[PDB]
Design a protein around this ligand. Structure first.
Ligand code: CLA
Ligand code: CLA
Ligand code: CLA
Ligand code: CLA
Ligand code: CLA
Ligand code: CLA
Ligand code: CLA
Ligand code: CLA
Ligand code: CLA
Ligand code: LHG
Lengths: 40, 151, 721, 66, 146, 85
């Protein structure tokens, strides 16, 4: 089963990483949309 | 040339698929007479509904049948099975001992007449199909009506 | 390189990564074993079919759950066909616009809505099933490829039996395929649509299967179906003529071809492909040896001819691929010019947005495939041409007088170019100087296309005379005095041909001839040339052979496809432009109560398309206003993609106007900055190869260019139509 | 139906019969029109009882149209 | 500790080289191979174990509704204390994962029952979802009629 | 809450007490449905009480159905299971 892991460790890694990154960013924007500034 | 094989083979060319042909020689047989049995036992004295929905029986028609028809392959694929009283020492094509009581009896061939009873019951039961389908009436209505007005 | 071991080996430069994808499908470079290749591509076709099958499943699925097809069905005239919905994120929801039927979605132009009405589809239930059936097929196709490469791969002998394959494909697929569809029409499409045209409403239509079972429902209309025995076995066939006719023309209520005709069409096509299927020799005697027949043709001019062809087209894929690509592309083009002139779908012609995008889509697909024929034809010359083993003789001579063919074709393009573009530069100059009498115009010195005008004239007077069975014309562009108007929109109308139409056709003659020149020159001179006597040893895809001989850049057959690729863009790009303006100016419009027809641009094509300034102003500048004013509306995306395409386009010029020598030297300075901070990759960064930079360049050029009109057109017709 | 029926059903089975005559040929054993009609013509001829009912319905369809 | 005799799931045959019956409960099952690496299995093993141990208890939750035919501060604290507690618990268990012939029986049997709860604990809910009805009675309440 | 009215009498007594013999406490010592077995003595009825009958049988006559070889020899019956012409 070593094989599947490696398979998931090529440029696909990039897609999974960018999909995870996109999901994070979009969800952040859902909770805090129309953000023109950091006010805290 | 439909007949000649020469395959590895993904099974269109080699020996089986005529193997199956041998064994549907038997349930097109049990299927036929077993289907006329309710038809003419009532001769003396379309959704249609029985018990629950018969899809439920199915799950138990493809259940046991599963637990059954499964193993049968096992023998084929490889002689033994071994799980239960179960013996299946007979050859893969046929395993008469143990599930045929007392007899043991195959060579005349009968097998050539059992495959002869086979594919005539195929076309007999293939009768039943296109028969009651494109017409709209059962196999025994038009048949009786066919010796009635031949021309 | 996964495909090859040495190729896989190890990566030392980034060039390895680019090569890996570039030769991924180059199956004949991974092995010299023909059987291995053939086995590879055969499975690859399965994998393809799976993807398009999945593609179809999503189109039916989206039509079911994410579309207002039902809503469009009751009111097709002013409901906008819309599939797919956009989630309300980072301001996206504005792309969901008023399309009618109390629904928010993006207006579509694929034309599935018109297809589905023709098929007699009435409910999302029906679309839902077809989507699943497609997915089930997609699962099969994908599985089938795995089974025929790892379990049971066919012999080379299997693929070589071309006769048997021919017989089936133009009979088993074409014939029965046409026949099978012919049955669905008269049993489902024709009955249900007949109801739909009577304003019965979809839910008030009986289910399709009720039409098939009992003849009663199907027989009250089309009473030929009444006889159970049917007049078919009587072989009179005259009785059947109610459900199928040779009426032609166009239904004045639905604006599409009579399904009453298409059923008869397929009925003929089917058996016509069933008979023609019984031609080639197989096993049971009757048939043809294509090898034999091919040999028979010979000539005082050709000497031996076609002899040896059968050997070539049975051992070389690139040879077969070129032929197929050349005509499949050519077929896509004639499809574009047959669906616009003879609208085959209900409420298709009325939907201007769909028609523009359909014609334009088929023109590009057809255009690209033809260019691909040039590539593989050239690949065949470099990789598979061997006179020692497979001489043809036809191929010879061609190679023998190749300097002749190109030189003549070179001249024709110059003659055409002058006698096309020059006329416009004439008109542009005479109008600027204030002398329109001088120009090539209908009002001044006119150059009437009397030949095309004469062919149209005979098509008008065809029904009754040279076509008794035909009640009406083939297409209403050949009608004469007829006019179909579905809704308040004009479905079709006789299209006039003037001096403005004489010029533009001669531009298409030109652009096609030059495109042919570039591509054909690359195929013939793919192996040898006076400049490079051994080009074939350099391969099909090589950048050059040095600055020697004054400079030998882009001498490869690959680069001839590269140069001809821009020209195929230049070509179509002006065909679709001809289509857009002519249809808007002299065909599409609104018809009133009195019968007065007002076109979208108001017949300005005839006197303003004869000038270059006229296309730049009355066409581009004018009809752009939609795309450049689409911000804050539902067509917001088109405005962005219009700007987005203009960028990927100008982005291509960066790759096309420069060379890799500059870039590699620039990287050197950048690698230094990395080595200073321990951030130098072990995989050394290299610039793109000389050839890749051209490949990268043309792709972005075509993308930015094509994409840019896409947004042009789709913003225009939607806001106006 | 009746006799009339059986007369058209036999001539839609004799529409078949006329392309038997093309090629019928004969000359058996002499001259050669048979052997010639069994040389290239026909590689059997109920393949042409079968090529019969195919093109024959077409020949009637066209002889009315031609 | 190798044998071709173990009651395979699918009779004749079922032998993956990784599985051998050395482990307890080895019914020869894994077409996917979801663990062909010893690092792969050694982890899966522990995984398939802890699960079972939990599932059993879950079963002990099906034991309570037949005895009779949820907090002082709902969730929140009740979880953090749980997280904080089972954390440390599972914490050390983690550190241990990476750092008599009679007992085989016990452990072979332990897994199989354990295997049961999971299939069980599973079943009771995908029968409860979409289908708002408890399983409490169903044994002989649904046995009245299919 | 949960004991209240025997859990609304097992609930399931609410939607279906299967079959509770109707004509209750009358001619009940018989069967569900009541294609009546009835009391016990005289005929069961719910034809049923044809019972084998003689000619001009009842079923529910419109004109047709099937049925029997009554009297002396009538089968194949002209009305049903007989050659047509
Ligand atoms: C069922 C699972 C499965 C597994 C484990 C394998 C495994 C293997 N295959 Mg097989 N194959 C399969 C299914 C499978 N295949 C199916 C269903 C088909 C029919 C299409 C094929 C057709 C096939 C061919 C012709 C060949 C192989 C080969 C191989 C071997 C090398 C892998 C490789 O080609 O490189 C790369 C691995 C990839 C996954 C490449 C990706 C290709 C997929 C299909 C892309 C999917 C399309 C994608 C959606 C396009 C849109 C992209 C978009 C996002 C832009 C390897 C043993 C090769 C071989 O035997 O070596 C000499 C070989 O010649 N396969
Ligand atoms: C080959 C194996 C096989 C066998 C042995 C049977 C056997 C039977 N089938 Mg099955 N069947 C089979 C295969 C088989 N089938 C297959 C493969 C299919 C799929 C196509 C079917 C589909 C099927 C259907 C749909 C039905 C049957 C039915 C029947 C039963 C007939 C009852 C009936 O209504 O007809 C005629 C009536 C009789 C035989 C009753 C005889 C009564 C005698 C004459 C005495 C009358 C006196 C009376 C009972 C008073 C009691 C006095 C007492 C002391 C005698 C019978 C037990 C029927 C059934 O299930 O019954 C409810 C039925 O509806 N079968
Ligand atoms: C009938 C269809 C068909 C088939 C089966 C092939 C098959 C093949 N071609 Mg051919 N080709 C075709 C049509 C076809 N071609 C057409 C119509 C053209 C004209 C444009 C070409 C032009 C062409 C060239 C110049 C070459 C080939 C080559 C090849 C061979 C391998 C190359 C490869 O692996 O691809 C590699 C795939 C890539 C490098 C992917 C590139 C990225 C694409 C182009 C971007 C597409 C953009 C997308 C559609 C929209 C944007 C999406 C994005 C924004 C996300 C292979 C035998 C090569 C060869 O040497 O032959 C042996 C070769 O150099 N082809
Ligand atoms: C192959 C062509 C194709 C294309 C281009 C699309 C494109 C799209 N789909 Mg469709 N889909 C397809 C085939 C396709 N689908 C097929 C064959 C099915 C049947 C299984 C579906 C079932 C489906 C559903 C149920 C939904 C979509 C949705 C969507 C949209 C949201 C993107 C998304 O899924 O989020 C990202 C995808 C992932 C994170 C998983 C990978 C997007 C326009 C969504 C939508 O329409 O939004 C309202 C939606 O809910 N699709
Ligand atoms: C007469 C029946 C028949 C049919 C319907 C097909 C259909 C097809 N063939 Mg096959 N072929 C046939 C006979 C047939 N072939 C025979 C007898 C041979 C031996 C010489 C071949 C050898 C052959 C090769 C080498 C190839 C094909 C390929 C194809 C596909 C090309 C896609 C297309 O044409 O458009 C439309 C596609 C469809 C309408 C999909 C049809 C769905 C399934 C496949 C139909 C199943 C039939 C069903 C029982 C009815 C298509 C699925 C090409 C391919 O795609 O490779 C996989 C390919 O390269 N065929
Ligand atoms: C040279 C140009 C030309 C073309 C392209 C056609 C084409 C056609 N003709 Mg016309 N025809 C022509 C010249 C032409 N004809 C001339 C010069 C005459 C006078 C002798 C006719 C007299 C004629 C008759 C009487 C009929 C046709 C018919 C047809 C159609 C069917 C042909 C067929 O049965 O099978 C291929 C087809 C569209 C048939 C038709 O009208 O279809 C409904 C028909 O019966 N043609
Ligand atoms: C619109 C076309 C275009 C664009 C965008 C560029 C952009 C650039 N040029 Mg170029 N150039 C062009 C045309 C263009 N040029 C033409 C026609 C010529 C004459 C032949 C040149 C000649 C030229 C020279 C001689 C040089 C440049 C250089 C540069 C870089 C300068 C760095 C910079 O300012 O910003 C950085 C990059 C950008 C602003 C654009 C990057 C594109 C986007 C923003 C990246 C985001 C990608 C996004 C996620 C989309 C993903 C796509 C998806 C499919 C994955 C920049 C990449 C110089 C350089 O290389 O400096 C390092 C340099 O030496 N150019
Ligand atoms: C596939 C079977 C088929 C069937 C059932 C029909 C049936 C019919 N045809 Mg069509 N036809 C066919 C194939 C068929 N055709 C083919 C392959 C062609 C060649 C393109 C034609 C060309 C044709 C023309 C030009 C006309 C018809 C017409 C008709 C209708 C009147 C028949 C008549 O008067 O004489 C039959 C005329 C023929 C040419 C028969 C040839 C068909 C045989 C089967 C070819 C083999 C009738 C409904 C007429 C019509 O549509 O009414 C206005 C008419 O004018 N047919
Ligand atoms: C300095 C910061 C620091 C941090 C961030 C940790 C963190 C941790 N310690 Mg440690 N510890 C520390 C200092 C620290 N310790 C010091 C100074 C000592 C004395 C030498 C210890 C002695 C110690 C022991 C003996 C143990 C830990 C354990 C743990 C883990 C228990 C996780 C848990 O479930 O609790 C709560 C979980 C959540 C809040 C989630 C956790 C990773 C335990 C462990 O190893 O688990 C495997 C363990 O037994 N620690
Ligand atoms: C003014 C309006 C009147 C129209 C007449 C002028 C317009 C047509 C142009 C005349 C071309 C002559 C064709 C002769 C008919 C013809 O092609 O003859 C074909 C001739 C026949 O050779 P064979 O008899 O050997 O052929 C059989 C064997 O060779 C093959 O098995 O072969 C050659 O001529 C070889 C040299 C090629 C000749 C190259 C000339 C190509 C012309 C290019 C223009 C194409 C125009 C297409 C437009 C759609």
């Amino acid at each position: 089963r070593d094989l599947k892991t490696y398979l998931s460790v090529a440029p696909v890694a990039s897609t999974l990483w960018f999909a995870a990154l996109a999901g994070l960013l979009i969800e952040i924007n859902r909770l805090f949309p129309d953000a023109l500034t950091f006010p805290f | 040339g439909l007949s000649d094989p020469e395959g590895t083979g993904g099974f269109i060319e080699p020996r089986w698929l005529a193997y199956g042909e041998v064994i549907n020689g038997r349930f097109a047989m049990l299927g036929a007479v077993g289907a006329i049995a309710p038809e003419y036992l009532g001769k003396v004295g379309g959704t249609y509904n029985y018990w629950a929905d018969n899809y439920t029986l199915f799950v138990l028609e493809m259940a046991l049948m599963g637990f059954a028809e499964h193993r049968r392959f096992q023998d084929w694929a490889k002689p033994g099975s071994m799980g239960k009283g179960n013996p299946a020492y007979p050859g893969g094509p046929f395993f008469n001992p143990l599930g045929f009581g007392k007899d043991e009896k195959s060579l005349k061939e009968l097998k050539l007449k059992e495959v002869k009873n086979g594919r005539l019951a195929m076309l007999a039961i293939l009768g039943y199909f296109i028969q009651g389908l494109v017409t709209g009436v059962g196999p025994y209505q038009n048949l009786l009506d066919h010796v009635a007005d031949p021309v | 390189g996964h495909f090859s071991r040495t190729i896989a080996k190890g990566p030392d430069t980034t060039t390895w990564i680019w090569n890996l994808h570039a030769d991924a499908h180059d199956f004949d470079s991974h092995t010299s074993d023909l059987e291995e290749i053939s086995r590879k591509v055969f499975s690859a076709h399965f994998g393809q079919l799976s993807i398009i099958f999945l593609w179809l499943s999503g189109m039916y699925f989206h039509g079911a759950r994410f579309s207002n097809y039902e809503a469009w069905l009751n009111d097709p005239t002013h409901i906008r066909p819309s599939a797919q919905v956009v989630w309300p994120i980072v301001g996206q929801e504005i792309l969901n616009g008023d399309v009618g039927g109390g629904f928010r979605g993006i207006q579509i132009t694929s034309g599935f809505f018109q297809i589905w009405r023709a098929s007699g589809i009435t409910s999302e239930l029906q679309l839902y099933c077809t989507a699943i059936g497609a997915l089930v097929f997609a699962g099969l196709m994908l599985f089938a490829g795995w089974f025929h490469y790892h379990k049971a791969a066919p012999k080379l002998a299997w693929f070589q039996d071309v006769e048997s394959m021919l017989n089936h494909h133009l009979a088993g697929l074409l014939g029965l395929g046409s026949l099978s569809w012919a049955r669905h029409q008269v049993h489902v499409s024709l009955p249900i649509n007949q109801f739909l045209n009577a304003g019965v409403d979809p839910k008030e239509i009986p289910l399709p299967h009720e039409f098939i079972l009992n003849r009663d429902l199907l027989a009250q209309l089309y009473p030929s179906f009444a006889e159970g025995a049917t007049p078919f076995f009587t072989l009179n066939w005259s009785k059947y003529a109610d459900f199928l006719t040779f009426r032609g023309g166009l239904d004045p209520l639905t604006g599409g071809l009579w399904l009453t005709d298409i059923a008869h069409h397929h009925l003929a096509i089917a058996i016509l492909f069933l008979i023609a299927g019984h031609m080639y020799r197989t096993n049971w005697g009757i048939g043809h040896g294509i090898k034999d027949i091919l040999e028979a043709h010979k000539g005082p001019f050709t000497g031996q001819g076609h002899k040896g062809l059968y050997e070539i087209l049975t051992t070389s894929w690139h040879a077969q691929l070129s032929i197929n690509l050349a005509m499949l592309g050519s077929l896509t083009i004639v499809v574009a010019q047959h669906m616009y002139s003879m609208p085959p779908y209900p409420y298709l012609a009325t939907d201007y947005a769909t028609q523009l995008s359909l014609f334009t889509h088929h023109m590009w697909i057809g255009g690209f495939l033809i260019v691909g024929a040039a590539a593989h034809a050239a690949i065949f010359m470099v990789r598979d041409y061997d006179p020692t083993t497979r001489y043809n003789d036809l191929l010879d001579r061609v190679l023998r007088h190749r300097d002749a063919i190109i030189s003549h074709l070179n001249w024709v393009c110059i003659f055409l170019g002058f006698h096309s573009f020059g006329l416009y530069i004439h008109n542009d100059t005479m109008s600027a100087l204030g002398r329109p009498q001088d120009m090539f115009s209908d009002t001044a010195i006119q150059l009437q296309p009397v030949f095309a005008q004469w062919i149209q004239n005979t098509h008008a007077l065809a029904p009754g005379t040279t076509a008794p069975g035909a009640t009406a014309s083939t297409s209403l562009t050949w009608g004469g005095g007829d006019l179909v108007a579905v809704g308040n929109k004009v479905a079709l109308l006789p299209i006039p041909l003037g001096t403005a139409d004489f010029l533009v056709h001669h531009i298409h003659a030109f652009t096609i001839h030059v495109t042919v020149l570039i591509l054909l020159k690359g195929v013939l001179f793919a192996r040898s040339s006076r400049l490079i006597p051994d080009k074939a040893n350099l391969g099909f895809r090589f950048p050059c052979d040095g600055p020697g001989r004054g400079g030998t850049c882009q001498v490869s057959a690959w680069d001839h496809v590269f140069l001809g690729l821009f020209w195929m863009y230049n070509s179509i790009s002006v065909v679709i432009f001809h289509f857009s303006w002519k249809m808007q100016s002299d065909v599409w419009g609104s018809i009133n109560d009195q019968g007065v027809v007002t076109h979208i641009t108001g017949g300005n094509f005839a006197q303003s398309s004869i000038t270059i300034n006229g296309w730049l102003r009355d066409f581009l500048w004018a009809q752009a206003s939609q795309v450049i004013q689409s911000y804050g509306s539902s067509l917001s995306a088109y405005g962005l993609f219009f700007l987005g395409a203009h960028f990927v386009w100008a982005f291509s010029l960066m790759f096309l106007f420069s060379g890799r020598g500059y870039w590699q030297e620039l990287i050197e300075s950048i690698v230094w900055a990395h080595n200073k901070l321990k951030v130098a990759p072990a995989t050394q960064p290299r610039a793109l190869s000389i050839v890749q930079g051209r490949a990268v360049g043309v792709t972005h050029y075509l993308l930015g260019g094509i994409a840019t009109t896409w947004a042009f057109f789709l913003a225009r017709i939607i806001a106006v139509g | 139906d009746f006799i009339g029926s059986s007369t058209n059903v036999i001539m839609v089975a004799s529409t078949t019969l006329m392309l038997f005559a093309g090629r019928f040929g004969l000359a058996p054993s002499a001259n050669r029109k048979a052997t010639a009609g069994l040389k290239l013509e026909a590689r059997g001829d109920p393949a042409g009882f079968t090529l019969a009912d195919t093109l024959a319905c077409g020949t009637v369809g066209h002889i009315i149209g031609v | 500790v190798a044998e071709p005799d173990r009651p395979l799931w699918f009779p004749g045959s079922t032998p993956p080289p990784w599985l051998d019956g050395s482990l307890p409960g080895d019914f020869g099952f894994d077409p996917l191979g979801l663990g062909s690496d010893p690092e792969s299995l050694r982890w899966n093993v522990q995984a398939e174990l802890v699960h079972s141990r939990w599932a059993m208890l879950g079963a002990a939750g099906i034991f309570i509704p037949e005895f009779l035919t949820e907090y002082f501060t709902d969730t929140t604290t009740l979880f953090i204390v749980e997280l904080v507690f089972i954390g440390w618990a599972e914490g050390r268990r983690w550190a241990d994962i990476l750092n008599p012939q009679k007992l085989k029986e016990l452990r072979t049997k332990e897994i199989k029952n354990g295997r049961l709860a999971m299939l069980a604990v599973m079943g009771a809910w995908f029968q409860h979802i979409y289908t708002g009805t408890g399983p409490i009675d169903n044994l002989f309440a649904h046995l009245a009629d299919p | 809450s949960v004991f209240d009215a025997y859990l609304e009498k097992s609930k399931a007594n609410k939607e279906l007490n299967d079959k509770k013999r109707l004509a209750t406490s009358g001619a009940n010592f018989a069967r569900a449905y009541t294609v009546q077995f009835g009391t016990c003595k005289f005929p069961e009825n719910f034809t049923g009480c044809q019972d084998l009958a003689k000619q001009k049988k009842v079923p529910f006559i419109s004109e047709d159905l099937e049925l029997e070889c009554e009297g002396k020899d009538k089968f194949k019956c002209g009305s049903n299971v007989f050659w047509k012409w």
